[PDB]
Amino acid sequence: VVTSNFDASKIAGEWYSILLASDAKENIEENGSMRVFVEHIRVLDNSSLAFKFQRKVNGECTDFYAVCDKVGDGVYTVAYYGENKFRLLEVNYSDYVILHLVDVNGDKTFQLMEFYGRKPDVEPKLKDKFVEICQQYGIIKENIIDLTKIDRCFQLRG
């Protein structure tokens, strides 16, 4: 695990969305804007990270792109359904990543925790590792979704 300062060439590549939590479960539910399934991360020449992910819109699996600009060591900013600012808490370039994001629209804000894996699934130990981390941020256990149990739009990948 790399808690402190990271690299980026080593976070690039293909990832799978595994767990997703939000103190506003409304955003990550079917039809939720933040119900994304990440695919690949590319580090651009300007140090920004180009994210490619799928979400199911109107019953159809969709492709989305977003460039996140570096604002801090391990921190980025993205415009998507508002202004987003997320921080990478833990990164094992080989296995997974867990990040914290906050979305803002005017005076309305909400929280989001994500767990990506180099593979489609991780061991049920990290699962709990994530639950704990959410517990301590205000994201109730009933607000944590396991994406492996639903359609993660794999056809679009590649």
On whether the CB atoms of residues 111 and 102 are closer than 8 A, the answer is yes
On whether the CB atoms of residues 3 and 100 are closer than 8 A, the answer is no
How many Å apart are CA 118 and CA 99, to the nearest integer? Answer: 15
Q: How many helices and strands, by DSSP H and E, does the chain display?
A: 1, 10
How many Å apart are CA 88 and CA 86, to the nearest integer? Answer: 7
Nearest to 85 by CA among 64, 68, 97, 67: 68
How many Å apart are CA 147 and CA 134, to the nearest integer? Answer: 16
How many Å apart are CA 136 and CA 142, to the nearest integer? Answer: 14
Q: Which 8-state DSSP code applies to residue 94?
A: T
- Output the CA–CA distances (angstroms, integers) from residue 148 to 18, 33, 98, 99, 132, in the order listed: 6, 18, 16, 18, 19
> What are the structure tokens assigned to 6, written together?
């990271």
Neighbouring C-beta atoms of residue 124, cutoff 10 Å: 8
Domains assigned to the chain = 1-158 (2.40.128.20)
What's the resolution in A? Answer: 2.1
Q: Is 61 helix (H, G, I), strand (E, B) or coil?
A: strand
